[PDB]
């Protein structure tokens, strides 16, 4: 009785929202655009290919700096890199190498990892012992860990496969604020620029909208048709971009609360692993599992151009903060470092 | 052209790649052993035998190393992380032989042993593991004798003309695993029958690892 | 914490041998690059040798190449110096100093006690060489260099150390502008090519002491004659 009236209530609400949206869906990003010039054809070389990893490339992240990298690979190995130089700055040794997400903190000091050992490891990049070692052990998750993002050096942000999100006090090891309401495992989370929300994307074909100091979920975000792998801010943070198994990239914008534009094509039937935006947010570089990097017309969803040097899958992609290169990690163990010529 | 700080930036670099090779050489000698099974069908029976995420077990057998890893406890979803697993040596599945005319728990009207069989079929021909041998247990042995006289096997099999002698009902139970096998040519299933008071259970690794080791080694040579 | 004990220091004949230990303990002895520094009594610093982490790489100051020979036991975390022929030039306080070379390192941060031994090219300038100075005034310090220290990939390799009167020196400024670990922000390295200025901000006691600009654009590495501040 009450239960049944209860869920009852939840769809005239979920039809109260949908209504809602479609009331200010007016007009279409592609109408809005179409009169704008594209970008042409995006040509970018291998500037660089990191050597060194001897099994699958599982994540990335470039430092603030936009010269060091942290890649993880499932040799148990943690390598940062000096992307001008190819230089190895460090090689840590993790404890599981099971890992499958890697975080680099915007102080450059710490670097986080880990994966189906439920853990997040913090590790000190700045020790006067000259090694690197580890200073935290962020337990908690009951599910394997599948991303993890810095807001400083004593807060960071994880997403699990035990359907919920987590914000941690690093000093302290404690988890001061759980984020539940995935129904699936979470698979990838992103942080908007100025680190007062987070958007993540599960398992369950929907991204939520996150308040990192309130707790809550502000907006939840659909239209994906199965896992979403993969999700990230647009660079002014009022928007966020998607993609899921389902060989679809999204836009979905936070104050339209609603999807505003698909970025498919009919050749493309696979699987995309990783989403990033170029420094203006013109460009949708998207990593896939047909081996490829496609470099999409953020604005009039076109395919600008595409990246094409792994033999696997490009498991993770980063563009660098002052947008000078993109890299791109494959399952087939190298990193490699893309920019155009004039 | 490099400066004096950069030569020495480049030979860290080149001593980090040094001591990389070296930890692939000894990653490379480890056999990585994916268990899997389904509940009290004696998986953890044969970690003891062999001797809050991912359980490993290291043991070594005639100096050869084994990384076991169990993934019980993840009680994510599957598909997510399976493919991590790809690559290893050969995959150890456990399956209760006594089990044939229980009944699961969480349904209360399915059958533990088409369960099990449900689990291997997924598994074996999941797409990540299409050159992965299966190295398939088949525990609780004495137990299963003790109820075939009681309890015929035509319970979990109404399809099954055979008698109720114990090596009969134990081989047929055999095939039906192996029977769910679509890649023959590119993988082979190893059966063993283990008991609680078997010894041989880590020779029948060690032998069914070694023939994996080298049919790898012969397809990379060229041979195969 | 980060130790460096060296030990085999003492009186000698000239022409004779001696033996020179640094002892590590505290940090990965084995992940760094070791150097000796020497100064003779009443004069600046001056750089002996250096062997690589890993001891592949190992250079030596000409006016000791091929009497010394330095070397490393890294599971007894062990930095050794051999000296052959030792002439009065030699006598001098030997320091054992750790240098780490990657990306945004601080070489040169942390030095030894020093052990005495007594025996019985870019030209880096700092023509002021001492400074009367009163508490909470700001000084500044002149470094110059014959050559060009802005190397063609943006670096510029002048480091700046304090020696204080009874104590090992300490890392203030490498490459010029970075301020090392555990120094106040008061100080500040200010430079253009062959002309570099240390900025001391609200001098207090402790700054007072003796002040060396090196280079590490090449082999060998050379000091300043140093720059005294007095009260």
């Known amino acids: 009785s009450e239960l049944d009236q209860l869920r009852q209530e939840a769809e005239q609400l979920k039809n109260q929202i949908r209504d809602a949206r479609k009331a200010c869906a007016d007009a279409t990003l592609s109408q809005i655009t179409n009169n704008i010039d594209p970008v042409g054809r995006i040509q970018m070389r291998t500037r660089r290919t990191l050597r060194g990893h001897l099994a699958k490339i599982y994540a990335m992240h470039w430092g603030t700096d936009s010269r060091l990298l942290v890649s993880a690979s499932q040799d148990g190995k943690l390598i940062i890199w000096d992307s001008y130089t190819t230089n190895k700055v460090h090689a840590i040794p993790l404890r599981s190498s099971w890992v499958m997400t890697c975080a680099y903190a915007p102080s450059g000091n710490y670097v986080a990892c880990g994966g189906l050992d439920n853990i997040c490891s913090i590790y000190n990049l700045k020790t006067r012992e000259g090694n690197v070692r580890v200073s935290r052990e962020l337990a908690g998750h009951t599910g394997y860990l599948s991303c993890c993002r810095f807001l400083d050096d004593n807060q960071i942000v994880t997403s699990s496969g035990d359907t919920t999100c987590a914000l941690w006090d690093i000093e302290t090891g404690q988890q001061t604020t759980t984020f539940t309401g995935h129904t699936g495992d979470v698979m990838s989370l992103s942080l908007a620029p100025d680190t007062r929300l987070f958007v993540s994307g599960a398992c369950d074909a929907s991204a939520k909208l996150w308040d990192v100091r309130e707790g809550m979920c502000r907006q939840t975000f659909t239209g994906h048709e199965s896992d979403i792998n993969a999700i990230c801010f647009f660079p002014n943070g009022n928007a966020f971009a998607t993609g899921s198994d389902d060989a679809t990239c999204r836009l979905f914008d936070l104050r339209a609360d609603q999807e505003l534009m698909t970025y498919s094509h009919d050749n493309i039937i696979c699987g995309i692993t990783s989403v990033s935006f170029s420094k203006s947010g013109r460009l949708l570089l998207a990593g896939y599992d047909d081996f490829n990097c496609n470099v999409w017309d953020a604005l009039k969803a076109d395919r600008a151009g595409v990246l094409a040097g792994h033999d696997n899958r490009v498991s993770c992609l980063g563009v660098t903060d002052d947008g000078m290169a993109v890299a791109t990690g494959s399952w087939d163990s190298f990193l490699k470092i893309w920019n155009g010529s004039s | 052209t490099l400066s004096a700080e950069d030569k020495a930036a480049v030979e860290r670099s080149k001593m980090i790649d040094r001591n990389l090779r070296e930890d692939g050489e000894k990653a490379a000698r480890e056999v990585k052993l994916l268990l899997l099974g389904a509940g009290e069908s004696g998986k953890n029976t044969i970690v003891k035998q062999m001797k809050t995420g991912i359980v490993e077990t290291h043991f070594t057998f005639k100096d050869l190393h084994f990384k076991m890893f169990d993934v019980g406890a993840q009680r994510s979803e599957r598909k997510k992380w399976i493919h991590c697993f790809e690559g290893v040596t050969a995959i150890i599945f456990c399956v209760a032989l006594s089990d044939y005319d229980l009944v699961l728990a969480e349904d209360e009207e399915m059958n533990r042993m088409h369960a099990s069989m449900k689990l291997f079929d997924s598994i074996c021909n999941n797409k990540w593991f299409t050159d992965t041998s299966i190295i398939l247990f088949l525990n609780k042995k004495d137990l299963f004798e003790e109820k075939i006289k009681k309890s015929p096997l035509t319970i979990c099999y109404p399809e099954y003309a055979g008698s109720n002698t114990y090596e009969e009902a134990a081989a047929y139970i055999q095939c039906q695993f192996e029977d769910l096998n679509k890649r023959k040519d590119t993988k082979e299933i190893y059966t063993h029958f283990t008991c609680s008071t078997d010894t041989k259970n880590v020779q029948f690794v060690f032998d069914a690892v070694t023939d994996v080791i080298i049919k790898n080694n012969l397809k990379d040579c060229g041979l195969f | 914490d980060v130790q460096l004990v060296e030990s085999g220091g003492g009186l000698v004949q000239p022409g004779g041998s001696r033996k020179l230990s640094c002892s590590a303990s505290?940090?990965?002895?084995?992940?760094?690059?070791m150097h000796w520094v020497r100064q003779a009594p009443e004069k600046g610093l001056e750089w002996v040798a250096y062997?690589?982490?890993?001891?592949?790489?190992?250079y030596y100051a000409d006016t000791v190449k091929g009497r010394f020979t330095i070397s490393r036991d890294d599971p007894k975390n062990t930095l050794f110096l051999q000296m052959t022929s030792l002439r009065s030039e030699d006598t001098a306080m030997y320091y054992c100093?750790?240098?780490?070379?990657?990306?945004?390192?601080?070489?040169?941060?942390?030095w030894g006690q020093g052990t005495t031994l007594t025996v019985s090219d870019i030209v880096m300038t700092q023509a002021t060489s001492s400074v009367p100075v009163t508490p909470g005034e700001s000084v500044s310090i002149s470094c110059r260099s014959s050559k060009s220290l802005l190397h063609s990939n943006g670096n510029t390799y002048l480091y700046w150390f304090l020696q204080r009167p009874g104590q090992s020196p300490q890392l203030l400024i490498y490459?010029?502008?970075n301020l090392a670990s555990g120094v106040p922000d008061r100080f500040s390295g200010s430079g253009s090519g062959t002309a570099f200025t240390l900025t001391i901000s609200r001098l207090e006691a402790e700054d007072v002491g003796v002040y060396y600009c090196m280079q590490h654009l090449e082999y060998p590495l050379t000091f300043g004659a140093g720059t005294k501040l007095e009260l």
């Open positions: 100093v750790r240098s780490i070379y990657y990306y945004g390192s601080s070489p040169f941060d942390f």
């Open positions: 490459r010029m502008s």
């Open positions: 505290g940090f990965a002895f084995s992940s760094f690059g």
């Open positions: 062997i690589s982490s890993g001891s592949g790489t190992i």
